[PDB]
Structure formats: structure tokens, C-alpha cells
Please model this.
Amino acid sequence: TIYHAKDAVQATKPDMRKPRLVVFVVGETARADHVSFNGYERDTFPQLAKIDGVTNFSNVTSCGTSTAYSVPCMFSYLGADEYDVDTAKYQENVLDTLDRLGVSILWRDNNSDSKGVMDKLPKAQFADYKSATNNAICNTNPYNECRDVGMLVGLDDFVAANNGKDMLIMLHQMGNHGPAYFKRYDEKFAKFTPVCEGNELAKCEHQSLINAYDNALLATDDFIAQSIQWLQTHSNAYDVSMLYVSDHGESLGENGVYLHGMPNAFAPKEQRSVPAFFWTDKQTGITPMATDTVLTHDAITPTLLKLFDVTADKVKDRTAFIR
Amino acid sequence: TIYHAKDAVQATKPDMRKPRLVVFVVGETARADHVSFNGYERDTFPQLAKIDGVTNFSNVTSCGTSTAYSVPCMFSYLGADEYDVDTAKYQENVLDTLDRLGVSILWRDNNSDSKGVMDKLPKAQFADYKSATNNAICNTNPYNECRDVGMLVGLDDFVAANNGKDMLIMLHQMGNHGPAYFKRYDEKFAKFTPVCEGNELAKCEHQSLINAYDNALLATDDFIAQSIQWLQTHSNAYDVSMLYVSDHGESLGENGVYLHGMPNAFAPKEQRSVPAFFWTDKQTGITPMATDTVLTHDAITPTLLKLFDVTADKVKDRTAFIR
Ligand SMILES: [Ag+]
Ligand SMILES: [Ag+]
Ligand SMILES: [Ag+]
Ligand SMILES: [Ag+]
Ligand SMILES: [Ag+]
Ligand SMILES: [Ag+]
Ligand SMILES: [Ag+]
Ligand SMILES: [Ag+]
Ligand SMILES: [Ag+]
Ligand SMILES: [Ag+]
Ligand SMILES: [Ag+]
Ligand SMILES: [Ag+]
Ligand SMILES: [Ag+]
Ligand SMILES: [Ag+]
Ligand SMILES: [Ag+]
Ligand SMILES: [Ag+]
Ligand SMILES: [Ag+]
Ligand SMILES: [Ag+]
Ligand SMILES: [Ag+]
Model:
């Protein structure tokens, strides 16, 4: 492997200060401009609106327009300008660094896989939550589709197994994956109706397409809120924080363009404008950056290091989501 | 949208000359006759007085007497005589033109919002500075009211993200908004005492009302001075300038009239006589008009175009603050 933060050190250890517990939700296909906090005309995040300590970031751009391109870049040391997708898996990434320094890494996936990010770490630290073998919440809908909230089940046991250590938990969402947006949420989030069903998105009435997309966002609002609520059950023993960033956006009929995956040189802005949220308990001493900070996926790696009191010279002066 | 400047062209581009960086402070409720430079009996602008290259304009008349009426007119192509507040939001305005031409437009707001001026542009180019979500300077007074100087924090982040482009930054002030003028300034500006603190201004003793109003001007003097000082930190790489114009004046008990918003047809002179200041660095080549030029809000649009070397037929003959 080729290293980029061999110099990295953790300034303080959980035996002298409170251990730190962080949930990083890797979102899927969510657009910044369909978030209520960013000006959208519908209340797509009603549950997050009721939680104090949530920062919504209004100017975040993804590294690319697809899961395969963006997810390795989100955890990279290279930054979007120097990032290479084909050789990313051979580079030391930020999870490699945190694991080397003693942070317990867990990756639960209801999307696909880590796109190479977890490859160097033991297989037991990656868990497939797309099937009923691990996910207890797949029988809540007629498609028998496993839900993101299922990734929260049993995390109390993971904390008990790593009692006293620093912990970083990645939850890779099914989220707003298309084209069958109507399958991405249970009946309790079917607020906006009617919805488009079927696959020929250009043939669907446009408003019904948007309705299905917005209902999926409601289910993600719920998932992030329940992630924070879980972390709050551990706030006494742990300094708890939550980071959410979507891997890319989505086209929804603009210029007749749908879905994502366009090359960056010709991708419409809708495919790279993503939401990001950060929450932390009042005890942690962590302070968010201003909500209007110009941010990209390049901010994720220095954010994760900073959350765990880690200094790496490569990202020393890189903009983060927190101060 | 109804267009007025589709012909606009930029004569020189920032890839072949110095990029230009301009702050336009959109003022609030300030009266021209309470400015020291216009003959007021008190030194209400002590810090601006120490800065070389500031022109004070002694004869400026606002488009109207309220924020909702004046602010869209300040950015309009139509001029006061043809301006229609009810359809202003659907007209192409000067920020639309400059954005189309590639100038990076930013609007930070510690007042209310842009009154429709920014509505056609991406929402990430507007930022609310009335709350600690963005404003780092709120805990400086017993009301926790966020301060205009907080709009200057993190502007280096913005400049770095637009490195080498032309930039126009609007800062919409809380300024001298009443009736609670006493809330508008921190203690270091409480120079004139005693101060009116009642909401029913006609019940306050007249001198205490004046004192609160003048103290708030001292805070605006400080804010404008700090805006120029920030620009000065970029003057080697950028051609820097600062424009200040208030949106309207204020009645302070004359003929029993308080606050503002009087219809133009019978508004008192003190509600439309506003200060204007222009500052520029020596290298920009920008030259101010004579300080006693008869000016109105109609001069703002041609001033902004000229600062970025843009010509548009609609305002070719129009008087500006600069040559
Ligand atoms: Ag490197
Ligand atoms: Ag110790
Ligand atoms: Ag993803
Ligand atoms: Ag994706
Ligand atoms: Ag995955
Ligand atoms: Ag999926
Ligand atoms: Ag539609
Ligand atoms: Ag616990
Ligand atoms: Ag949309
Ligand atoms: Ag920071
Ligand atoms: Ag016209
Ligand atoms: Ag105003
Ligand atoms: Ag007076
Ligand atoms: Ag006003
Ligand atoms: Ag405003
Ligand atoms: Ag105000
Ligand atoms: Ag008096
Ligand atoms: Ag600079
Ligand atoms: Ag002139």
C-alpha cells in the first residue's frame, strides 16, 4: 500500500479523556435543493428540524456523480483534484489511518459495498445489511426491501463490545436510489401523492416523479433523526457526533436528463450538489464551521481526523466541516 | 423573467487583467443629515474619517422609504420613474447580468432577505447572517443580537473558492433599524447618553432617541471601516472597491413622524435623503464623481456595471457614482 499519513498521531487517547463515538451516514442520490433547510418549498426534513445542534451545510459539491467514483474519493487523502478512481484502492485512506491509531471501524452497507474503502481492514468490520440475514427490517413493505433503519439494530451491542474505545460507524444508505424511488420508503412516509411507479421516468408525469423522490427524502430524515437519537443514548459515556453527506445528486428531468453518472465535464449541476448535516452533543466541545462554508467531499477526511483528535500533515490546512 | 440587458458585454476579463473584488454594503435606515461629513453636529463616522480615498456623497435621494420598496429598485434597470415594486422580482436585475457574465455574486444578509433580488440565482449564493448558524459575532451584547461585522468573517473562504474571478459581495446591514435603536450597537459605541430604550418612540425624551440613533451610526462607521480594511488585505491580487448606500432614511419625531415607510407622495425629506460612500484602492483606476453630484438610487446599477467593465445599452447615459 502507498501511504499518505504515516505521520498521523492521535493527540489524546480514550484512557485519559472521554471516548468518542461517531456515526457517518454515507447518503445516496440526495440533492441539496430538495432539502427544506436549503430553500425547498416542501418540508422534506421535519424530524431533523426539531433537533437542536444540527448544522445544515448549504454549499457542498460531490467529488463525482456516481457511487463508484465518489465513495472512494470521500475517504481519500488526495482530494478531488488529484484523486484517481482506478488506483484509489491501493492508497492508504482515512479509515486505514484511524484503524491504525486504535479507532474501532465498522461499516454497515444497505447500498452495495464500500467501493474498495474497507478492503485493507478485516472482513469482520464490514457487514452486508441488504439482506434479511443481517437486517431485521425487510418485511415492512411489499417489495421485501431492507430498510436503512435496520442498520441501527444492535449497535448498542457493538458499543458494548468496544467499551471505552473510540468508535467510527459508517452506515451506507439505500437512500434515494432510483429509478424506483417509490420502493425506497415505507407507507408511513407516503406524504406526497400520487407517485410515479415503473421505470420509464420520462414517461411518468413529472410531479408524481418528484413526489416519490420527496417521500424517499422523508424516510432519510427519519433515518438520520433515529441515528442521532441512538447516539444520544450514549452521550453520558461518549462524546457523540453524527456526519451525513450524500455521495452525489440526481437529475430529475432537467434538459430531459434523468438519474446520475454523467462525466464531471458534462454533468449538470444537479448531479453534484449534495446535502450535508453535522450534529454533536453539547458536551463534545466540537464546533461546526459556518453553514455557508464552501465545502466539497474533500472536507470529509480532515473532519473525521479532527473528530478523533488526529493530526495528519497532508490535510493539515484542508477545510473541514468543523473548526 | 423580463430582460433588460441581454446586450451586456464585459470589455476585459479577469484572465487578462487583475480580477476585481467589490463589497457593496446595503445600508439600513441611515439619514444623510446625521453624517459628520454632511454637516452633522456630532462625529458619527470617526473611523471612516481616517481612511484615505473615501468619497462622501452629499446629495443622494433614495428610490423609496422602505426596505421592500427601495432594495429591489437599487438593483433595477428601470430607474425610479418606471420602477414597479409589484413586478420587480420578475425583471432581470444588475446582479442577474453580472452573474451571467461570470462575476461571482454573494449576498450576506443580517437584515431580512434580499427582497427578491437574489431569487433567480442559486440559493447557495445567499446566506442568512441573522443567526449563529453563520454569524460568529452574536454573543457581544445582552440581547445576543448578531452583528453586521460578523458578515466579514470567512470572506477569505469565499475569495479562495473564487480565486482569480471577479467578485461582487453584497452585505445587507441591520444598521440603524428601529424602533429598538438601542439594540443595534455594542457597548463600546454607547458614546451619546442617555439612550431611549422604549418601543413607543413618541414617549421617549427626544434627545435620548437621537442619542440611541447616533450610537447605532457609530457601529455602522465601524462596520464600513472594517469592510475596507478587509478589502485592503487583498489589494495586491485584486482591484478592490467599497460602495455604501442606505436604502432609505428615518424620521426622528419631525412633525410627529417616526420610523419610515411613508408613501413617496408625501414622505418627509429625512426619509429619502441617504448617505453614500465610495472607497477604492489607488491601483483600480476608478474615479469618483464630484461629492456634490445630484445622485439617486438610479446611480447604483451603472456604478456596479462600470466597476466590472460592463456596458449595457439600457443605462449607457445614466449618471453613476464613478466616472
Ligand atoms: Ag499523498
Ligand atoms: Ag492523564
Ligand atoms: Ag452511496
Ligand atoms: Ag450513489
Ligand atoms: Ag456501500
Ligand atoms: Ag440502493
Ligand atoms: Ag413538475
Ligand atoms: Ag453507552
Ligand atoms: Ag427538483
Ligand atoms: Ag474549520
Ligand atoms: Ag428593458
Ligand atoms: Ag436595507
Ligand atoms: Ag436629526
Ligand atoms: Ag430599510
Ligand atoms: Ag436583506
Ligand atoms: Ag434589522
Ligand atoms: Ag431633541
Ligand atoms: Ag487575497
Ligand atoms: Ag460620471
